[PDB]
């Protein structure tokens, strides 16, 4: 088996270790596992995956081949590889293209090595992104091979938002499911996710302390919730920042100061609409909005000196790199840990005091500077996106008539009731004991003893 | 010579109006309605019939009401949550309240019947505003005259809003109505940081026990529950959860609680032996947040700790089997809407009996009946979607259009994400916060107008 | 129940049948009081005491008293302040044939007749050997006004930091007549009462003073201290913003470790007595203020003046001269809201709009906030303070100072606190009053790190 | 140029440890404030300091800063897993004696501390020690009496290491007088607490990657360590349990809200199976030990245990835990460096898919320095720089030229004055940015203190 390219193979026996463990750590996932291994429903399957190539996604890969299917396999990032796991899936025989470290080019490399085998597009039919960059292009560079794909399971919000525009403008080939918006996956992945892992990776990149030092999160959506909450537990005295007031509102009721880094929240593009006295006070600038430029040039010359910038958002334009690039001096401390001097752009002092942290050159810093979520979150998203592709592959979008076809062109999501029964077993794996309705109580609240116990509407 | 009126004591008028002066001023998203709607009159004409909790932030939602021209008749919707200062301040104000705090069960439906009826007939009422649906079950039930004439319905909270699902699903519900409930500057804001401030200030009210290294159970994990759970564990509690839906009980192991079943394995046979003895005898408060019937039952009660405190914060008292604690058990008042409830039997007790249980407002809501419910600057929130909802439903005019337009607008809505927004930056803003508004190029790039709505219908927050 | 008993003063007796039946529920909160009404009834160890005692006539020094009874004593009780007496607690005392001198709301002309009420029984000095204080007040007129009685008074228990400064400061002078027992600074006392009782009872006060949504507001809490330290956390946990002064850079150091922002009202920190070193920006924010310091004037005029409109204005410190509450009083129209909670109109002062945005809500008139809002500590907190006060009005009664000769009492003049070894029993029952299982060493265990299976297992030095 | 005074695992890292000096340097305020104030006195001027200490970016600073004030040093670790690679590299090239690296053996360790002790085969003109543990100073009481007959005294950091020092004056056998920094506020209640809620969390995290949040842990002991260590699991969602033997640390426990429980049935430990809570250890995700004590997690508690449960150590010595019991009946299955599978199946051999074994973190030692980087710079600031004030003093005082007469009211074991202390305090303060208040006349006179401080009275716990 030569149909791979990792950064070590020899990596391979520490990746299988910690795959071992962290089956342990995913019982929707390995649940799926046991009640679908008889039944194979993805035998058949061809799947191009484009997502982080970690532990956590190893154990995805091999519950969707235990389960039947083909599979060839990619980063969504340059950064968020785990070595020893890209090197235990290629060990096992599974075609993967993906380092810790890769540049852009390479980046684009690897995606084309799954969509290409043996110099010819791969007859895949299934197709699982996260980000929306292979789905971006298969659209644009290799269309002919979308007319074989049954479906797409897109995994963050982002990608969501991509293929929602390209359903406007009648550019979506394949249908799609939203596994974003499952309970299970948004409001656990997104969330608890970033709680975890936020704090973690400021500790490995920097090691510095966060208790009493002042913080600013751009945004306080379910990341923003879940970022404010790793830096608050710690000690910081969090800042919130936001364009939408039903966030902002709560981010006041649950305790923080909400700030804007413009006065009156009005950003004219100049230099004296930033609150000076807000930013020369912050010491950790913390992006999560999905959004362009919220952390802005401006912004950045007014932060107090030796601040930490990071994004933990999905793209590396929610801070300003560019111009940190075009006009400031990086020294690189460590890997993923860059040291940006504000004195110029030729050369810089050692010793000088007036520069900024910058972790993971603005990209994803939970993947870049340490390993994201945990096992036990990912469980949630990833057995979500098992259910979404044996519902999509068994649908079989690819052989319909061109009638029957327009009917099916949606973006879905998953059934409650799977939402629940990926619930479930999370709550099982904490050893939680869920209570059973007796019959009158379901039937005076309204439900069935089975469930779905909530309306589609209910927010949680 | 204003006498269409019953409260408690007409004197605590005085002490009432400071209040609300104080209320107005914590409740920025109402007051700017009234400054922003009083000019036009959107209520001139309107002819309410209102039932909800007779508090000081009620006071002031009446008040917004009739300053935008609305006429009222009000009673509460439950027999403890009155504040008699408020009563009192709204009655000598000239509005017709019909409320207390004590009622009886039958002094409770009298007032709710006194708004109904004017002079010893039914009032030329058009807009009804409800917090649980007592009152609109009882139009619908002996008023359906009256309902022709009714524009819709703009009910307050959870349970209303499921008595309302079950009208519209079984044919007889008369008008439309809006559910104010899952506006998100409701649900998310009242019923989960509202239970949060006031959970625990009831409990303290009530026992004034120390709450730190408690064993407490929360049953239910919604808005309530959450709030709730978050109310006893800031206050250093060990709580723990039960739910039926694995969904919330996935969030509550993820907001760092431990998720239980008060029976074994999870299965309620109705039998002693399903009882958890051990868990239930390590616990000294339990709190129920359902909505449901019955989640804290006989068995449950029998198996608690000595002197454990028992209680609710759900919409009805049948949360909690008082039935069988009447029945079996002798109670001892401690003073109002506290009592000791011996479990040595019904014939009397003695005063130092150590096998009792402490009850909290006869199990009715506790958060009102112990203390004062949710605060004004997060009530601020409920009332403006009450008063927008209001606004809404009479300027359609649902009881004028001919038969085949009520049938297409015979419906349980919510109010439109704009308007949500719009109540939260006032909200924000009276916290002092600072919104940042999105530049073209931002707006342009995550797909939404600069002013809003910043977030797909499908969006949970 | 004795027949005829008048030797008292309440608000309202037939409150006595409530306060009973809240003592029923607080004996079971507080268990290791109890244990030692258990423990030492039978043995007496307090037949003949005669104790004056002068603390916050709550429904939890109701048990204290009838502990003190229980194990012989007699007592003559007044509260230690005007407002922190609960009525229903002092009935039930009165009932009991007990004097006690305490109602919610005297004036400072009452609260002073109420010391003397205990002080002298049928118009003369009451025979009292032993004496409970919590402040010093009690124990300043004795010295002050009724010096010949201590000359057979065997010793003083102090509660409460302000208190225990107060005898510090004697000694030193040598104007303290007998020895005392600090209670304050037995760990089950300050680490328990004074940090934990501010957490529970703080938030608590406000709100029932208040009602005001505390969850995204801005606080200052001047003080990190033991009761900064728990109101601090009492707000925190709520939501608030808070930011905390001190001028001990250790407990400031504290406090950004905990997760404040440490600030001050000042510029640069420097109180030069001017309008002009306020801060005014941070005050013109703050929603609520306030002091936990024990010192003089820490919200002052110009604070007072620049704080942001409708901001609460509180102390938990022992007596009201944190705040300078006179200042309002002279420039400042005072409207009542309800008892112990008043607007302050900035506006002048003869009279006020109504409808004025521009005032302060003051509680409990700078007073003892939890304590005048509300009920101050909760039952199962003060069991760890008032089974100190027992254990140390015990051991200063069996040493019987007053009967030694002039040589032997000059020894044994002091302030002292109780042993380790009393400080860990009364924490052991404390814990089993939650339910908590504490382990026992092994032989080889206590061995290995030099203490006793029993203990105590820290040096006098541990700070906790 | 031509020094080869040292042993490091890898001298290419100096530069990159250097890097991180630089970083750390800007976040030790105190530290650089003393460098600042002492520079030009150079009031360590002839001083030669024995130091034995994790050899982190931290103790980096530290030695330079001693250095900067004009010692000389001769450098180890105090523990085999604690060294950051790095910040020894960058040590030993600027011309500094240090033997050190992380992953040494036990004779290695002990090599590292003789190797400070001698030089050139002879022993160092020593006059001062700086130790964390007291294993550096149980060496010379044992096998170097000699040289503590020239040396000024002992600034010890941590509680074991005085612990022993008291046991020494007690037995009368110590020969030099100490400084206990541990006692510090800027150091107990600053290190111990808030170092260990920092680093308890990253070091599982970065050994494990497991969710913490909505799983059990039980930490033993809670004093400082405990308590720091118990809200570093539960700021991060973990339902916490503690134990005790102190019923006053057990209070508190219960008032932070924590249950307070043990793994003995009633508390009793008998050394019999039965004695185990079974039911209780069979829900435990994670055990901690914090106390300093010995066998605090035992044998039968380890084979109690919930499958697969984490098991660490965050107290100085390995010993807390016994791990001699699971070397001689488990099978140790490496995942990474500092993380093993003990599989409770046997002792010899092990199935890979096997679900019954435990995680042990660092061997059993430190687990904050063992699997991630121990406390951050900014609380170790208040720790050094009590140690450089401690070694001033004691240097000044020269306790080895001193009559008899003079040594013996001088041999004791003392805390740095309360002055001092607060001096560390605010230039932490100032650190984060706070602004402390200063006193009036009138209120410093009301409260008791002069306006500079000290404010509190030496009973004060804080
Ligand atoms: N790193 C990870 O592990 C991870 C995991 C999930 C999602 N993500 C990414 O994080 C991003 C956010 O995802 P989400 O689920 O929180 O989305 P979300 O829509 O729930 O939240 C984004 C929030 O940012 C706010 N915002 C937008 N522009 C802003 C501005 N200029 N200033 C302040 N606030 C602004 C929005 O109002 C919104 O509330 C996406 O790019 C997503 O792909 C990352
Ligand atoms: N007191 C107040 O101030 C206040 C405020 C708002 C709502 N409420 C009332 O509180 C109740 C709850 O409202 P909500 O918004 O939280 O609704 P919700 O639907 O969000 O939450 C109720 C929860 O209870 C759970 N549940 C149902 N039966 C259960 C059982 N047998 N055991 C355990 N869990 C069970 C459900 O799964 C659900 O998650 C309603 O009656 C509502 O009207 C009271
Ligand atoms: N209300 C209650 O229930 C209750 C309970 C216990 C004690 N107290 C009282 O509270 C007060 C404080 O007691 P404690 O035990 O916390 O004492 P403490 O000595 O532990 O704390 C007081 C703190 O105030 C700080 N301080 C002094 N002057 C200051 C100033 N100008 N600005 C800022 N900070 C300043 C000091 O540095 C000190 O840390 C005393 O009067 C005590 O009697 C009240
Ligand atoms: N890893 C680090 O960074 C770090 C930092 C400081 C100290 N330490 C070390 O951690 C240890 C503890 O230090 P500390 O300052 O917290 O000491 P401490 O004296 O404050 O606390 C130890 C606690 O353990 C308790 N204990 C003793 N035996 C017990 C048993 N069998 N079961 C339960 N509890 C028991 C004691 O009652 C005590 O409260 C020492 O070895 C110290 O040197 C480590
Ligand atoms: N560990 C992880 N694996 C895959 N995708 C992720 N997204 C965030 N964390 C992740
Ligand atoms: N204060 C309050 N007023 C009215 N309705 C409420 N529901 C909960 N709290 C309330
Ligand atoms: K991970
Ligand atoms: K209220
Ligand atoms: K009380
Ligand atoms: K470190």
């Not at 919000?157 to 390209?166: E, I, K, N, Q, Y």
């Amino acid at each position: 088996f030569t149909d791979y390219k990792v950064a070590d193979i020899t990596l391979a026996a520490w990746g299988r270790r910690e795959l071992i463990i962290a089956e342990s750590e995913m019982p929707a996932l390995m649940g799926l596992r046991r009640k679908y291994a008889g039944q194979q429903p993805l035998k058949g399957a061809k799947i191009l995956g484009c997502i982080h190539m970690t532990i956590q996604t190893g154990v995805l890969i091999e519950t969707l081949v235990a389960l039947g299917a083909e599979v060839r396999w990619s980063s969504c990032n340059i950064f968020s590889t785990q070595d020893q796991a890209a090197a235990a899936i290629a060990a096992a025989g599974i075609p993967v293209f993906a380092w810790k470290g890769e540049t852009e080019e390479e980046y684009e490399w690897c995606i084309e090595q799954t969509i290409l085998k043996d110099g010819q597009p791969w007859d895949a039919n299934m197709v699982l992104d996260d980000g929306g960059d292979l789905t971006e292009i298969l659209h644009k560079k290799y269309p002919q091979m979308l007319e074989r794909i049954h479906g797409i399971t897109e995994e963050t919000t982002t990608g969501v938002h991509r293929l929602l525009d390209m359903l406007k403008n009648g550019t979506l080939k394949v249908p799609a499911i939203n596994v974003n918006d499952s309970v299970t996956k948004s409001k656990n992945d997104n969330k608890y996710g970033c709680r975890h892992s936020l704090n973690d990776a400021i500790k490995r990149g920097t090691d510095h302390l966060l208790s009493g030092k002042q913080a600013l999160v751009i945004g306080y959506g379910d990341v923003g919730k879940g970022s404010s909450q790793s830096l608050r537990q710690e000690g910081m005295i969090v800042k919130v920042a936001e364009v939408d007031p039903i966030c902002a509102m709560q981010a006041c009721m649950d305790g923080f100061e909400v700030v804007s880094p413009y006065k009156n929240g009005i950003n004219d593009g100049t230099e004296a609409s930033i609150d000076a006295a807000l930013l020369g006070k912050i010491d950790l600038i913390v992006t999560t909005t999905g959004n362009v430029n919220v952390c802005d040039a401006n912004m950045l010359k007014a932060l107090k000196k030796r601040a930490v910038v990071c994004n933990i958002g999905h793209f590396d334009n929610e801070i300003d790199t560019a111009f940190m690039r075009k006009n400031w001096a990086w020294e690189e401390v460590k890997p993923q840990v860059h040291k940006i001097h504000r004195t110029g752009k030729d050369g810089f002092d050692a010793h000088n005091d007036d520069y900024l942290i910058l972790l993971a050159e603005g990209r994803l810093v939970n993947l870049g500077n340490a390993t994201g979520h945990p096992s036990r979150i990912m469980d949630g998203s990833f057995a979500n996106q098992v259910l979404a592709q044996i519902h999509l592959f068994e649908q079989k979008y690819a052989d319909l008539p061109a009638a029957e076809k327009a009917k099916r062109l949606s973006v879905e999501v998953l059934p409650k009731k799977l939402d629940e029964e990926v619930a479930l077993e999370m709550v099982k794996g904490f050893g939680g004991v869920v209570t059973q309705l007796t019959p009158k109580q379901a039937e005076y609240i309204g439900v069935s003893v089975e469930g779905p116990f909530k309306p589609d509407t209910y927010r949680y």
